[PDB]
Amino acid sequence: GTENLYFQSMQVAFSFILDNIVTQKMMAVPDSWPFHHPVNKKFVPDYYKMIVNPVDLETIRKNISKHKYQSRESFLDDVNLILANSVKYNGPESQYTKTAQEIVNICYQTITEYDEHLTQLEKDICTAKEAALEEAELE
């Protein structure tokens, strides 16, 4: 119905913004390529025993296309796991960890530039979510 589609359209807009930050900022970090794809479990089985919640940039983009993130908090938590998982697996002083730190810093700098509109859109999503839920439960 009307409220659901509009809800979806707002999620599409939010996703569009988040995906821009991933592709244009985070993926563009020099030497970021170890963080672009998920760790091959058959290559490094120890990784998946040590790291309970693996995350990489491809997986975050997939999550964005599945509309996992309705707010910057859940997005930023997955982005932070890139750093946290590296600190744990590779070490706090690893060059890989320094790259992940860079990926996190550029994400935050970019979210900050988009703050007022991401707040606006998050509010529009929360509102449309409520309106869609009312329409759905009132059929």
UniProtKB/Swiss-Prot annotation:
UniProt lists the family membership as follows:
Belongs to the TAF1 family.
Q: Name all Bromo domain ranges.
A: 11-114
Expression by tissue: Testis specific, expressed apparently in germ cells.
Per the entry, what this protein does is:
May act as a functional substitute for TAF1/TAFII250 during male meiosis, when sex chromosomes are transcriptionally silenced.
Show which stretch of the intact protein is covered: 1523 to 1651 of 1826
Instruction: Give the gene name.
Output: TAF1L
Subcellular location as annotated: Nucleus
Under what name is this protein listed? Transcription initiation factor TFIID subunit 1-like
Q: What organism does this protein naturally occur in?
A: Homo sapiens (Human)
Subunit details: Can bind directly to TATA-box binding protein (TBP). Interacts (via bromo domains) with acetylated lysine residues on the N-terminus of histone H1.4, H2A, H2B, H3 and H4 (in vitro).
